[PDB]
Amino acid sequence: LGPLLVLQAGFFLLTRILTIPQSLDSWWTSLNFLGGTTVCLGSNHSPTSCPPTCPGYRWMCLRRFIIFLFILLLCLIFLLVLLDYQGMLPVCPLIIPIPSSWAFGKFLWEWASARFSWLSLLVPFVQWFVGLSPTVWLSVIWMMWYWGPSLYSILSPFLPLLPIFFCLWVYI
Amino acid sequence: NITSGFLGPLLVLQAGFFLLTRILTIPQSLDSWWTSLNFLGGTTVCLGTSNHSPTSCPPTCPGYRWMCLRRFIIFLFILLLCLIFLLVLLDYQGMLPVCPLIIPIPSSWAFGKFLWEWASARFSWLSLLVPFVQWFVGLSPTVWLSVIWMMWYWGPSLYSILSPFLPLLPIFFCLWVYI
Ligand SMILES: [Zn+2]
Ligand SMILES: [Zn+2]
């Protein structure tokens, strides 16, 4: 009795995972428009779910595949985070006792700061911003969500004059 | 002296401008490419005129917010991809010291070796599928190409039995009961 239920649950969860790409590419295709789907060029079916006869269906499958690939990658990265959180990646820090946790992250950041040498200047600013934002981060996300495209639109006309006087500054 | 002295830094300025303007549009190119994948390789129109493509919304159009979002999202992925690439490069030089599971550090692909060894350790059944894959390589390459092409031909036929798929767990479950 138990094993039948276990197998049914496993199959249903596998179906959920396999249909995730449907939902995800449908969401992204919604992003293309003002939050609303469309109709595949050629019964007017959305290009996120075409019938097998529809030519776009072939494309859809390819699309479903790529999304799925990214998902796995994300999952992998997510997995790769947890191990790094738990300190199961015994990465030797640049010259020694091991970093109990986040060894990979600390090593990677140390290497980047040591080599690129401008992230050294960037890090103080980012640390300032994050530390000063226990809750300000939430508000600036809201501002970015609303004003961010707007401020980008206002800065963009002066976006190309920006390199000109940046060059002037570099000359001086 | 003065001529070349000025041109040098200014040459760097011009080259930087050109490279940044060529490489900062890649989010737009990839967004347009995916939107093309959505409709058999075509642009279509936005919801808002001149019928501009939805990946090049003017600021007046309401989609410029929307577009930016996905453009930004695409931009993020690029960094991630780049990061992967960067990692995929560093491991080759062995610049990632990862101690192997129980000792000298691996000369190259240390991170890849540790990850694969740990993953194989965690799942015993996974390795069971490894040999057949090699056999797939070990089989006739032409046979593998024919199989893949038939699957492409059988993809629509693959899901032509998609409706019977749902009962698959029950009947197999029934087998598990009778097993
Ligand atoms: Zn279609
Ligand atoms: Zn638009």
Author numbering:
A (entry chain B): 9 to 50, 58 to 110, 150 to 226
B (entry chain A): 3 to 50, 57 to 110, 150 to 226
The authors write:
To obtain a better map of the HBsAg dimer, we expanded the HBsAg hexamers (3 × 2 mer) at the top using C3 symmetry and focused the local refinement on a single HBsAg dimer, yielding a map at 3.60 Å averaged resolution. This map was used for model building of the HBsAg dimer core. Although it was predicted that HBsAg contains four helices, we found that residues in the last two predicted helices form three short helices (H3–H5). Additionally, residues 111–149 of the AGL could not be modeled in this map due to the poor local resolution, indicating its large conformational heterogeneity. On the intracellular side, instead of being a flexible loop, the CYL forms a defined structure stabilized by a CHC2-type zinc finger motif, with C48, H60, C65, and C69 coordinating a zinc ion. Interactions between the two HBsAg protomers involve multiple residues at the bottom of H1, CYL, and H2. N40 also makes hydrogen bonding with the T37 of the other protomer. These non-covalent interactions stabilize the HBsAg dimer near the intracellular side, complementing the inter-subunit covalent disulfide linkages in the AGL on the extracellular side.
HBV is an enveloped virus with HBsAg as the only protein on its envelope. HBsAg exists in three variants: large (L-HBsAg), medium (M-HBsAg), and small (S-HBsAg) surface antigens, all of which contain the amino acids of S-HBsAg. Small spherical SVPs are protein–lipid complexes formed primarily by S-HBsAg dimers and are the major format used in prophylactic HBV vaccines. Between H2 and H3, there is a hydrophilic domain known as the “a”-determinant or antigenic loop (AGL), which is essential for the viral infection process.
